[PDB]
Design a protein around this ligand. Structure first.
Ligand SMILES: *[C@@]12Cc3cc(C)c(C)cc3N(C[C@H](O)[C@H](O)[C@H](O)COP(=O)(O)O)C1=NC(=O)NC2=O
Ligand SMILES: [Cl-]
Ligand SMILES: [Mg+2]
Length: 135
């Protein structure tokens, strides 16, 4: 199960916000979220399970950031983005998102692991500007 991954347990020891998705199910829904994640977003575990994590996006979320994630998952690439996300109550925060595939011995992606770090506006501002400049 989700907590049997050694890196999941590792992340738990620092109380990091993370989710696990199951890409073998249509639309790659979340199948575990840490307590940190549930508190950040304002949802109960049972509510988040079964949803694709795009439910944290909204009108001011940059579609180009979201497309970086989609492509990374498509192309088999680790991805890190900063993007605007939305809590259950509609209030927003900046989310630095770290995504990687968890693979079996043949390279088949068995789950995705996604770590979320809430970051300040100023940090998001500077990260995105550096991203854009470096690009
Ligand atoms: C989540 C974090 C997250 C973790 C993991 C493991 C996955 C697989 C996805 C996500 N989120 C992105 C979303 O699931 C989807 O991949 C993207 O929207 C890209 O595809 P679409 O163009 O939407 O079809 C998340 N997105 C968030 O905004 N916030 C999160 O916490
Ligand atoms: Cl997805
Ligand atoms: Mg559910």
């Amino acid at each position: 199960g989700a907590m049997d991954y050694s890196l999941v347990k590792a992340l738990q020891t620092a109380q990091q916000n993370f989710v696990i998705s199951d890409p073998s199910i249509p639309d790659n829904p979340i199948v575990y979220a840490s307590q940190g994640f549930l508190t950040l977003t304002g949802y109960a575990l049972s509510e988040v399970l079964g949803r694709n994590c795009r439910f944290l996006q909204g009108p001011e979320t940059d579609p180009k950031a979201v497309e970086k994630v989609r492509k990374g998952l498509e192309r088999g690439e680790d991805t890190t983005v900063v993007l605007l996300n939305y809590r259950k109550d509609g209030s927003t925060f900046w989310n630095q998102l770290f995504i990687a595939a968890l693979r079996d011995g043949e390279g088949n992606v068995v789950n995705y692991l996604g770590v979320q770090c809430k970051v300040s506006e100023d940090y998001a501002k500077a990260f995105l500007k550096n991203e854009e400049n470096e690009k």
